[PDB]
Structures are given as C-alpha cells and as structure tokens.
Amino acid sequence: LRLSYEKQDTLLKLLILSMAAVLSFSTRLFAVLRFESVIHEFDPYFNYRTTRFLAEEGFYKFHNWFDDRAWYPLGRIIGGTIYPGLMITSAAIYHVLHFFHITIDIRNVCVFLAPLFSSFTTIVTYHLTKELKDAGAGLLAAAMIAVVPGYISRSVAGSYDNEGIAIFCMLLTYYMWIKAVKTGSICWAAKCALAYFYMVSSWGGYVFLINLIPLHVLVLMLTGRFSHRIYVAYCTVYCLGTILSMQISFVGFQPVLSSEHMAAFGVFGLCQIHAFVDYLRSKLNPQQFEVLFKISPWTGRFYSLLDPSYAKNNIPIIASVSEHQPTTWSSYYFDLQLLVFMFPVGLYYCFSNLSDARIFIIMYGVTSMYFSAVMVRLMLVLAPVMCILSGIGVSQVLSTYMKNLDISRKNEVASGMILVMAFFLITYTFHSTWVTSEAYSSPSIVLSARIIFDDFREAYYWLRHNTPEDAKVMSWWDYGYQITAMANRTILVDNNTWNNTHISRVGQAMASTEEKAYEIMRELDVSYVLVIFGGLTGYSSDDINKFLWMVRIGGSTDTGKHIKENDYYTPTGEFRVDREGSPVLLNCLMYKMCYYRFGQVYTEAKRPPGFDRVRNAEIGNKDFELDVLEEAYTTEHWLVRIYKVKDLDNRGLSRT
Amino acid sequence: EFVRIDPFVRTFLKKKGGKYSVQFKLPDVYGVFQFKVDYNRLGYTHLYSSTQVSVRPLQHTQYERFIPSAYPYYASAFSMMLGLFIFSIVFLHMKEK
Amino acid sequence: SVVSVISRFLEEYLSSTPQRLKLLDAYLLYILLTGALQFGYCLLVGTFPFNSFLSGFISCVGSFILAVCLRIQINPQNKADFQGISPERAFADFLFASTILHLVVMNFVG
Amino acid sequence: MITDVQLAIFANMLGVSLFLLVVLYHYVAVNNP
Amino acid sequence: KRPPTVVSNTFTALILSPLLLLFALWIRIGANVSNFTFAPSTIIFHLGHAAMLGLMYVYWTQLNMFQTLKYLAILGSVTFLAGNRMLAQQAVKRT
Amino acid sequence: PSAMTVYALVVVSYFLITGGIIYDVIVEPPSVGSFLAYRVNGQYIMEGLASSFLFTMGGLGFIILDRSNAPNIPKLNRFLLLFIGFVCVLLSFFMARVFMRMKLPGYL
Amino acid sequence: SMTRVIEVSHWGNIAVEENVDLKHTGAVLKGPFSRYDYQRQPDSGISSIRSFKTILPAAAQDVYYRDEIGNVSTSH
Numbered sequence A: 001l002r003l004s005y006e007k008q009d010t011l012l013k014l015l016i017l018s019m020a021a022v023l024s025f026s027t028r029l030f031a032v033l034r035f036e037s038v039i040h041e042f043d044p045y046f047n048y049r050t051t052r053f054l055a056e057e058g059f060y061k062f063h064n065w066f067d068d069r070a071w072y073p074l075g076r077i078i079g080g081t082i083y084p085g086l087m088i089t090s091a092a093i094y095h096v097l098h099f100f101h102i103t104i105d106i107r108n109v110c111v112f113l114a115p116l117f118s119s120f121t122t123i124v125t126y127h128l129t130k131e132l133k134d135a136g137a138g139l140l141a142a143a144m145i146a147v148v149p150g151y152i153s154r155s156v157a158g159s160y161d162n163e164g165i166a167i168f169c170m171l172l173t174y175y176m177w178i179k180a181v182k183t184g185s186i187c188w189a190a191k192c193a194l195a196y197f198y199m200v201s202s203w204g205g206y207v208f209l210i211n212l213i214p215l216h217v218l219v220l221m222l223t224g225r226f227s228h229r230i231y232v233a234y235c236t237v238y239c240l241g242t243i244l245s246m247q248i249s250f251v252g253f254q255p256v257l258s259s260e261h262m263a264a265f266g267v268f269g270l271c272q273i274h275a276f277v278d279y280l281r282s283k284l285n286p287q288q289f290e291v292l293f294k295i296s297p298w299t300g301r302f303y304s305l306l307d308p309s310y311a312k313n314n315i316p317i318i319a320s321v322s323e324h325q326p327t328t329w330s331s332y333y334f335d336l337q338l339l340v341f342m343f344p345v346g347l348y349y350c351f352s353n354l355s356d357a358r359i360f361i362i363m364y365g366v367t368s369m370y371f372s373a374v375m376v377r378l379m380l381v382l383a384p385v386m387c388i389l390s391g392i393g394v395s396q397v398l399s400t401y402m403k404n405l406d407i408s409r410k411n412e413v414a415s416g417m418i419l420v421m422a423f424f425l426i427t428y429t430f431h432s433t434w435v436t437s438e439a440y441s442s443p444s445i446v447l448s449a450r451i452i453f454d455d456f457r458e459a460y461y462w463l464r465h466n467t468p469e470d471a472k473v474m475s476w477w478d479y480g481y482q483i484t485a486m487a488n489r490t491i492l493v494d495n496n497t498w499n500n501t502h503i504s505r506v507g508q509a510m511a512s513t514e515e516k517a518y519e520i521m522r523e524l525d526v527s528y529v530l531v532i533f534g535g536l537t538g539y540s541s542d543d544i545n546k547f548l549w550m551v552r553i554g555g556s557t558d559t560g561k562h563i564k565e566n567d568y569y570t571p572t573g574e575f576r577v578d579r580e581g582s583p584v585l586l587n588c589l590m591y592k593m594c595y596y597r598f599g600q601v602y603t604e605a606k607r608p609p610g611f612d613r614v615r616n617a618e619i620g621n622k623d624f625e626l627d628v629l630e631e632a633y634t635t636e637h638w639l640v641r642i643y644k645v646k647d648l649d650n651r652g653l654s655r656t
Numbered sequence B: 001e002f003v004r005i006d007p008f009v010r011t012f013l014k015k016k017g018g019k020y021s022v023q024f025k026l027p028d029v030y031g032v033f034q035f036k037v038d039y040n041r042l043g044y045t046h047l048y049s050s051t052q053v054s055v056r057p058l059q060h061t062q063y064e065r066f067i068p069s070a071y072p073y074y075a076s077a078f079s080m081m082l083g084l085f086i087f088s089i090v091f092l093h094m095k096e097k
Numbered sequence C: 001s002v003v004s005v006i007s008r009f010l011e012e013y014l015s016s017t018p019q020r021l022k023l024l025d026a027y028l029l030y031i032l033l034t035g036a037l038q039f040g041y042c043l044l045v046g047t048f049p050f051n052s053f054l055s056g057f058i059s060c061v062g063s064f065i066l067a068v069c070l071r072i073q074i075n076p077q078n079k080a081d082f083q084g085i086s087p088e089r090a091f092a093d094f095l096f097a098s099t100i101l102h103l104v105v106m107n108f109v110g
Numbered sequence D: 001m002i003t004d005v006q007l008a009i010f011a012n013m014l015g016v017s018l019f020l021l022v023v024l025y026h027y028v029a030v031n032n033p
Numbered sequence E: 001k002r003p004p005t006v007v008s009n010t011f012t013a014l015i016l017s018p019l020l021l022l023f024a025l026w027i028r029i030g031a032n033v034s035n036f037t038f039a040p041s042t043i044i045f046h047l048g049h050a051a052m053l054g055l056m057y058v059y060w061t062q063l064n065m066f067q068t069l070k071y072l073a074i075l076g077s078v079t080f081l082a083g084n085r086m087l088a089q090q091a092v093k094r095t
Numbered sequence F: 001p002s003a004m005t006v007y008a009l010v011v012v013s014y015f016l017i018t019g020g021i022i023y024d025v026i027v028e029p030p031s032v033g034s035f036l037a038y039r040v041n042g043q044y045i046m047e048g049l050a051s052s053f054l055f056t057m058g059g060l061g062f063i064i065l066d067r068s069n070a071p072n073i074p075k076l077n078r079f080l081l082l083f084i085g086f087v088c089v090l091l092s093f094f095m096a097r098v099f100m101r102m103k104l105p106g107y108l
Numbered sequence G: 001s002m003t004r005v006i007e008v009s010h011w012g013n014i015a016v017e018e019n020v021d022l023k024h025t026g027a028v029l030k031g032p033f034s035r036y037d038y039q040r041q042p043d044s045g046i047s048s049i050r051s052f053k054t055i056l057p058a059a060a061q062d063v064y065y066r067d068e069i070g071n072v073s074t075s076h
C-alpha cells in the first residue's frame, strides 16, 4: 500500500503529539506510584481546603467567605485575599466529572490536576512554536518541554499548587499575543484579553506578563517596525486586560494605582502619540510639518527581584524561606541538561531572521533568564522559553543536515552530525528521567527512612480527636495550613504572613522566659502548643534550627526591644546547646520545651545519654521542670510534642 | 464587655424582667469577638462568662447601590451603549452620495 | 500664528475622506467629548465611588479605541496590512469586542 | 500496583522512541514533493 | 462627604447632551438608512442585537452573572447566525 | 548595532550570568575551596567561570559548524573550520557531564 | 458507630468496607501523658490499649486500612 504525503505527514504529527502528551502525564506521577497519594509540602493544604469548600458550598458563599479558624485574634477573609483560578478549575472539572457519573472525590481531582495541565502545556507549546517556524521545531519543542526537570519539579502528582496551571495559562496568553501580532486582528486580541484575565486570576505573576508585552511594543518602536497591526493588537489587549484584571477582588485598584502596571500605561500613551504623529506626517507637506515640529510605590516582593539585596538585608521574613537565594551554574545544569547548550543557537536563529514575533521571543528569553539568575523560585518561568528556543536550535540543525544527504531529495559529515544529535537527545531523555526519579519526587508529610515514621500525621490526628472543639494551638508559620487541614483546630499564625506584628508576637512568646511568655499566651487565649523536635529521628529541619529566625522576627516590632538576638550566643559568638551555651538560651521557653525529659534517653551506641542527633551535642540542662505547661502528648519518635498551657494557680499563688 | 483582645465596647446591663439584656450595635472592626461578664464584688462569688461570636465584615450583595452622587457615571456607560446601537444601524445601511 | 496650517489641513481632510469615515469620526468625537466631560466632573467633585468612575470612564476609552481600530481596518489604504480581514469580518470583530467590554463594564460598576 | 523500576523503564523507552520518531519526521519533512 | 443632588442632576443632563450633538452632526453629513430593505436575516440580527443590549441592562438590576451569561450565550448565538447570513449578503452586494 | 552587536552582548551576558555572578555578589564565596562535595547549589568563582565557558563554547561550536555548511567556500579552510566546530562541541558536552558527575556523586 | 457498606457486582466480586468509631470508655486519664515514661517503664500504661486483631473471612484480597486523613502503615 502507498499513502499520500499529506496523509503520512498528518499521521506522523498526530502520533508524535499523542506520545508526547502521554509521556508528559506519565513522567509527572512518580511520587503517587511510591507513597500513597496525598497532597504534600503543606503549602497546598490551604488550596486543598479551599477547593473542598468551593466543591461543597457553592461560589456565592465562597466569593464572600470569612474564616474564623485562622489568625484567631484577627480576621481573615479568604474570599478576597487569594487569586481563585485554581480552585475554580478544580471545582469545574469536579462538577463535569460528576454530571456524567464518573464520581471521583475532590482529593483525587486535586492530586491529578497538575499532570493533566502539564499534558495540555505540550500541545500549547507545539502550536506556539509552530507559529515561530516549521512544525518540526514545534514537535521538537513539545517533546522537550514534556520531560524538562524544572517544570516537573514544580508540578508533581500530589502537588496542588497554582504554578502548575499558571504556566499553561501563561503559554496560552503568549500564543494569543503572538497570533495577534502576526494576524493584526481585533478578534485575536480579544481572545488574548480573555486569556490574560484567566492568567491574572490564576497566578500572581500576571504583573510579570503585563511588563513583557509593553516592553516588547517599546522595543519594536525603537527598531522602527511599528505598524497598524501592533497598534490595534496592543491597544485592544490593554483596555480589556486592564478592566478584566480589575475585577479579581484581591487586585482591586492595583493596575491603575500601583507602580508595577505603569510601564503598560506609559507604552499605551506613547503608542497613541506615535500613531497620531505618523498620521499627521502624511496629510501635511514637510515644511509645514517641520514648522509645527497619590501613586503607590513598589510592593517589595517584586522590588527585591530587581535589587537582590533589599530583602536579604532588611526584611527577616521574606529571606527566611529556603529557595530565595541566587542560583548557581550547577543548579542550572541540573535542571536543564542539554537545553543550556541550545539557548545560544536559538537566539542566533532568531537574530538572523528578524520578524515581528521573533523580537518578542528574544525579549522573553533575555528577561526571564535574568530573573532566573536572581532567584531560584523563578527558574520555573525559564524552562518554557528554553525548550522553545532549544527546539528551534536543534530543529534547524537537523533541517540543515538532512538536506545534504544523498538519499534525501564529503556528504557523510551530515550523517555523522545526525548521529551526534540523536545521541544528545537520547542522553537528555535519560538525564531527565533520572533527575525526576531520584531527586524531585519526595513527600514532606512523611520522613522517608524501607521504614517510614509519620509522626506528623499521628500528632495531628490526636489533636483532632482528643481536644475540645474550640481548642486553640499556636505554632510557627510553616506549620500553619497543615494543622488546619489535618489537626483541624483554631490556629494563631499561618503561612500567609500578611500581619508581621502577629508573627512577631508569637516569636516573642517562643523566645522569652516562662513568665513573660506565659503572660503573652494568656493574653492571646492559647491552649495547646505544638513544637517539632526531631532530636531522636535526626531531622535537620526541626523547630530548633528555626529558633534564630524566631528571635530575629520577634525582636523587631516595638515590643521586642528586650529580645536582643546577640544574647543567645556564646561569648565568642557560637550557638551551642551544651553547657557552654548562653544562660538565657538554656532558660528560654523554647528550650524548656522540646527538651523535657530528654536528658536520660540513650540515642546512640558510643555516646552519652543526653545526646541530640541534629546538633551533635550534650544538653546543657539535663533536668528541669515546666511550671506553666503540662505535656499533653508526644509522638513515638519524639518528633512532635504538644504541651497544654496551664491555668492560673487556684489558691492564687505565684507559679512563676 | 465586647472584647477582641482589649474591650471594644463596655456597657451596663439594665435589669428588665429578670433578665439582664442590653441592645447595642457591633463596631466597625471585624474578626472574632467575645461577650464577657465579670462580677467581682467583695464578699460575692466571682462569676465569669464568655461567649464567642464571629462578625462577618460584609457581603457583595449588601453593599450600597444606586448612589445619587454617581448618577453621572451610571448614565454615561448607558449612553455609550445607546450610541453604539445607533451606529450599528447607520454604518451598515448607508447609501453613498 | 499657527492658524493657516490648521485651515489648510481642515480643508484637505474633508476631500480625502469618504462618507463612512466622516460619519465614524463624528461618532469618535462624541465618545471623546463624553469622556472629557466625565473626567472633568470627576476632577471637580472627587471620587467616593472610585470603581463606578473607573467603569464609566474606561467604557468611554474602550469604545474610543474600538472605533479607532475599526476605522483603521476599514480604510482601504491599509488593505495590504491585513490580508484576510475583510470589512465584514472587521465589523464582526468590532461587535464581539464591544459586547465583551460592555459586559465587563456592567459587572464592574455599582 | 506498579513498581517504580517498571515506570522508569517505560518512561525511558517512550521518550527515546518519541525523540527518534521526531528525528525521522524531520527527514520526511525535508523531502517534500 | 457627598455633593448635593442638584449638581449631580446638572451633570447628568450635560452627559446626555453629547448624544444630541452627535445626532446633529450626523444629519449635517446627510447619512441615510436607505440601504435597509427589511430582509428577514437583517431584521433578526438587529432584533437580537437590541435584545442583547437590553439584557445587558437587565442584568445590572436583577440577574446575577450565571443567569445573565446563559441568556447572553443564547442570544449571542442567534445574533451570530443572523449576522453571518447578513454579512455574506452584504459582501455579495458590495462586489 | 545591526542585530549582530546585540547578539554579541547577549552572548557575553549569558556566559557571565550562567557563571553565578549574582550568587558571588550576594553570597561571597572564596575563590577556590580548600566543587562542593555534597551541595548541588554551591558556587565557587573559578568552577563557575569554567563551566559557563563550557556552555558558551558549545553554542559557539554549533554556530561555527552550522555556518561551515555555506556554499562556495574553499575546501582546505572549510575542513579546518569543521574540525574546530566538532572539537568544541564534543569537548563542551563531555566535559560538562564529567564535571557534574564529579560534583554530585551517585549521578545516574 | 460502625457503618458496614456491601456493594455487589455481578461482573466480578463484592467489596465490603466498614467505618469504625471506637472509644476507650472506663477510667479516663488525668494529668500529663509522657512518651518517655510509657517507653522506659513497662509497668505504666496497664489499662491502655495498643493493638487489636480482626478476623477476616479467608477470601479477602484487597485490604487497605485507611483513616480519614490518609493511609496507616501500622498493621500486620
């Protein structure tokens, strides 16, 4: 049998795209295959609870929703404090899957939403790259973005975070904008406006997006390639995007008042002026023409990206997070193995044949690369551009060398180059698979040791079933959503960090002596206190290595003038938990906690009894008594300790 | 005492029909709050009672609408719509001169 | 001192413009005038209902921009910059974008 | 269920086949009528 | 603080005025509706468009967004069909 | 600039940026240690300079070879050009792989 | 309160799942609880419970023992 050229071409494209989507979805689920399917890293538990609310209460009750189970002393309005796109997507998929009886719980939909959107991203990338050049580059870019390790790290099965869907939204908006620049039509600009609105609601990076379209338009102006198509497209996108972005509740009046959305307004005014001047330069003769010839500043989480010194030197709550440091070349290579070796070739092809849409992709690449160099968390937005460009690069080489072959209609150098390129591609596939398997898939609720000890879940379950219905527990901001999702009790601080005075209050309570801290706890009406210890299990990320950050945050706001972080070190400036430790550290409330009855438990073979694995030291105070606290519970490996705050002394005694 | 962390409101309870009932308006500040009664009198049993009450701020169906001070704006948009319609009847069906 | 050039340009504009384009320019002047009066009122009394001011104002700006884009696409001097955007398709896109904008403006005003 | 050592082998085989098929497509695209 | 009602009413009348100005300018040009011929597709299109705008007004007072979006979906589909037919006829007559 | 000077600036910028310059500035590392033995995200100045050099040289080899394909070129010089390109690319790739293996044990 | 749900399917097999709320009634606990004393002193903790065994009908094939919050890895 024989087939037409069109039939075989279509079959090849279809088969390649199907295999790429299946691989994208398949590669994402490694963690689900290992440990039981549960939402992890305790950032998405908030999103998960929110999604459940939207799935069992409706939208109108969700739009105006007041949560009294978090930040107890204050009030938290969840209906207008977060971008709602992810919850809406999950609830819509859930209702569609329930109309046709395919009944699936909300948790399974939340767990497997990110792989599905990662599968959609492949098709979107293919179409985007097809707009740039020959479809072959599109297939290559789709296949490469399928297996890229950074994107697979920030979106794994069981990780219900907003970045996953966000990337797909951003790529859709970029495709619509490229199609509007190439086509020059109002319809495509309106589609781009709607896509941009969706993107605004889904992620906090919409600001980023609205500072790349205007910059590109401005870059195009300088070059002199400005035409009516770009004017029409950008202006139509601007008006509708501004308005649609307004009505997201959390945003409010941010776009017209704030300073992150001023580049767009400036470029819009410049575009109007330029178009009118160009129109006036045609109706009048050259001699006549020559004769004629309260606002908010940068918020700060965006400013630190421009100036990478402010957040680390001034604000002790933004730099406290782990993945806020600059990225090294080793990390760059680990995330992308062969993509880095192809970025320059893609940039060269773009710079060699300048078009009206190439300039935009070049600008995207450059700016995104800088932002990836100034932060680890923004490596994500770098993976999508790279693939595209890398695809182009690789594709071009193939198309250059598969024409020199004699069989196609010295010559063997081209065959050698084809073999070399195939080797590069297969080794990139193997690298991506290994990096996905052995590094990126991991749970944060369970400590993998094969023996696993889930002390966190056990403590949360006890706290859920054996406390009064109104018991209030206070912990660090890290374990904020996790308690409410699993322990299901009223908490004091949370992982939002929108009121630094409250977190400073809790830090003061955790970093002072028992008298002052008991006063604080009585004032805030707290009942149980949950502190992670991890001294027996050897857990590096315990609630004692964060004590220094507690002190720094607490001794900052107008009441911790007596905290004086330089009072918890040794005379020479060390931080030891042994006898040589500071006499105020060994009497801190945090030290009385998570060391009660820990003085006489053997934890090693050739080591003294009162030994701490994580600090490799010997407790300074072996025996002490808690005057204001009872031990309510302690897990099996002493990983989580819950203490019940005591009452006032009945006979009115001191009880220091 | 109507208290959040420190008393926002503090009133007397008028004796009426065997019950101590007071009628008052909740403050502007939202959050969770606590009704509190404290009766410490010399020689009398100290009694203390606190009930917890959450105060929703507002709903989007309860904002004030049809403000007179915004009669201009409410008008303007509608005129625009009307304008568009007339355009869509004249721009299409017009005979050139 | 700069009135003769204005007289010349105004005279010329009329000759090189058809009926539909003159009609459209009249509509565009109406939009601009309504927006200017609204903004002047806002500068006179202030903004207590800020969202209503934004809604009513950007309705004017959006209708102005859609009118300008329709005018650009219709004018046959640019027939070489679109290549497939026929006048009827241009009017269709105008109606679609206008419906979206008016819906969002209504959903934003008080 | 499905052991990992199976999922990894499946992903490796699928990816290698995918890239080889994409390379083939480039040959087919260069030689058009 | 809020302005007196007299000022707001004055500005509302002033905002109504530009429409009158537009109409005067249009009759100065001489624009006519002579090409309209009462063809069924054109009449259906204009009726559906007017109904869509009236629905847009009604949504502001009573209907919520889901109901209004549903009604708009239906009316916009109808107006789209009528408009496709009418624009095809117009393109034929133009050439 | 004629779209070539800008490309040269972008190449220089890319090399320098992939050298972890921001890392060096924000967190001052000593020039040569004593490759971090167990810390993936760890950047000495010398190792980073060397690696970013490898990346840029690989891109240069690709463009240098890709250009070689142009017609009406003398064969004696084109053979040498092709040799340089193949050498640069293969060395860059194999080196970078070896470096990452040495820095992060257990690789693959 | 134990809820027993028995779903029958003519294609293959029948799957039974039961939710169990269970409570230790007598002699409620007063004072502090200490993991240390519980471990390093076998006397203390007499009235408490640690484990209990269920008997299944010898044809059970897919047992899972899930909680309301996730899997539980403590069973034999």
Ligand SMILES: *[C@@H]1O[C@H](CO)[C@@H](O[C@@H]2O[C@H](CO)[C@@H](O[C@@H]3O[C@H](CO[C@H]4O[C@H](CO[C@H]5O[C@H](CO)[C@@H](O)[C@H](O)[C@@H]5O)[C@@H](O)[C@H](O[C@H]5O[C@H](CO)[C@@H](O)[C@H](O)[C@@H]5O)[C@@H]4O)[C@@H](O)[C@H](O[C@H]4O[C@H](CO)[C@@H](O)[C@H](O)[C@@H]4O[C@H]4O[C@H](CO)[C@@H](O)[C@H](O)[C@@H]4O)[C@@H]3O)[C@H](O)[C@H]2NC(C)=O)[C@H](O)[C@H]1NC(C)=O
Pocket (backbone or CB within 6 Å): A034, A035, A036, A452, G063, G064, G065, G071, G072, G073, G074, G075, G076
């Ligand atoms: C999601 O949740 C589910 C459900 O919770 C999780 O599944 C669970 O996973 C655990 C894994 O830890 C499984 O555990 C297994 O239980 C069996 C059964 O053991 C019982 O019977 C033994 C029988 O003993 C006989 O012989 C002795 C004399 O030797 C007699 O005295 C007896 O009377 C019997 O005749 C008995 O010995 C066991 O005793 C244990 O428990 C008591 C407490 O009651 C202790 O005091 C004892 O000291 C002892 O610990 C018990 O009563 C075990 O056989 C399994 O052991 C295998 O694995 C061990 C390591 O985990 C290993 O040490 C064993 O030697 C044994 O090894 C087998 O397999 C290896 C390969 O895997 C081989 O190399 C090896 O040769 C041998 O063949 C294990 O302990 C649960 O059954 C399982 N639950 C369910 C419902 O399926 C699931 O994991 C979760 N998912 C996650 C976490 O992702």
Ligand SMILES: CCCCCCCCCCCCCC(=O)O[C@H](COC(=O)CCCCCCCCCC)COP(=O)(O)OCC[N+](C)(C)C
Pocket (backbone or CB within 6 Å): A029, A032, A036, A037, A093, A096, A097, A104, A108, A109, A112, A116, D001, G064
């Ligand atoms: C666009 C509009 C339509 C949208 C469609 C949305 C598609 C959603 C795809 C997700 C399907 C969920 C499947 C699933 O839940 O599997 C998981 C874990 O079990 C597994 O091993 C599954 C891992 C891989 C299965 C992936 C198949 C998904 C195919 C979808 C096309 C089960 O978790 P558990 O909660 O442990 O279920 C076990 C409970 N028993 C009592 C039954 C034992």
Ligand SMILES: CCCCCCCCCCCCCC(=O)O[C@H](COC(=O)CCCCCCCCCC)COP(=O)(O)OCC[N+](C)(C)C
Pocket (backbone or CB within 6 Å): A063, A084, A085, A088, A089, A092, A194, A195, A198, A201, A247, A248, A249, B060, C106, C107, C109, C110, E059, E060, E061, E062, E063, E064, E065, E066
């Ligand atoms: C499949 C996944 C698609 C994801 C799309 C993402 C959408 C993000 C939603 C953001 C929510 C913003 C809140 C909002 O829009 O306001 C709601 C109006 O409530 C709504 O109508 C919500 C429906 C939003 C759908 C709008 C089209 C979105 C298309 C994006 C591709 C007010 O509803 P109402 O209570 O009806 O207010 C009208 C009252 N008036 C008297 C003023 C008329």
Ligand SMILES: CCCCCCCCCCCCCC(=O)O[C@H](COC(=O)CCCCCCCCCC)COP(=O)(O)OCC[N+](C)(C)C
Pocket (backbone or CB within 6 Å): A218, A219, A222, A223, A351, A354, A359, A362, A363, A366, A367, A370, F001, F002, F003, F006
């Ligand atoms: C903190 C992060 C900051 C991010 C900064 C973003 C950097 C953007 C990277 C550069 C973008 C390249 C754009 C580009 O390709 O323009 C080139 C070369 O021509 C020029 O571009 C010269 C103008 C230089 C302006 C470059 C962008 C500046 C924008 C600042 C607002 C076009 O060359 P031309 O010669 O102008 O036009 C082609 C004519 N030929 C005959 C030569 C063919």
Ligand SMILES: C[C@H]1CC[C@]2(OC1)O[C@H]1[C@H](O)[C@@H]3[C@H]4CC[C@@H]5C[C@H](O[C@H]6O[C@@H](CO)[C@H](O)[C@@H](O)[C@@H]6O)[C@@H](O)C[C@@]5(C)[C@@H]4CC[C@@]3(C)[C@@H]1[C@H]2C
Pocket (backbone or CB within 6 Å): A120, A121, A123, A124, A127
């Ligand atoms: C919930 C899921 C829904 C599906 C999806 O994920 C999320 O979300 C989809 C988007 O809507 C994408 C489409 C946008 C419109 C775009 C139009 C092009 O049509 C051209 O057709 C030519 C011949 O007539 C004309 O000449 C040209 O002018 C005209 O542009 C078409 O090629 C590509 C297409 C359809 C995009 C493909 C990928 C889609 C479907 C995305 C999926 C991944």
Ligand SMILES: C[C@H]1CC[C@]2(OC1)O[C@H]1[C@H](O)[C@@H]3[C@H]4CC[C@@H]5C[C@H](O[C@H]6O[C@@H](CO)[C@H](O)[C@@H](O)[C@@H]6O)[C@@H](O)C[C@@]5(C)[C@@H]4CC[C@@]3(C)[C@@H]1[C@H]2C
Pocket (backbone or CB within 6 Å): A238, A239, A242, A256, A257, A265, A294, C042, C043, C044, C045, C046, C047, C058, C061
């Ligand atoms: C796509 C569109 C989006 C919207 C927009 O273009 C692009 O971008 C908007 C800007 O954000 C502009 C506002 C800035 C702040 C400025 C404060 C004034 O406050 C005055 O308050 C009086 C009370 O008495 C005093 O008398 C005065 O002195 C004092 O200046 C206010 O009147 C005007 C206001 C709000 C600007 C109006 C135009 C806006 C909305 C611009 C639009 C054109």
Ligand SMILES: [Mg+2]
Pocket (backbone or CB within 6 Å): A161, A162
């Ligand atoms: Mg986040």
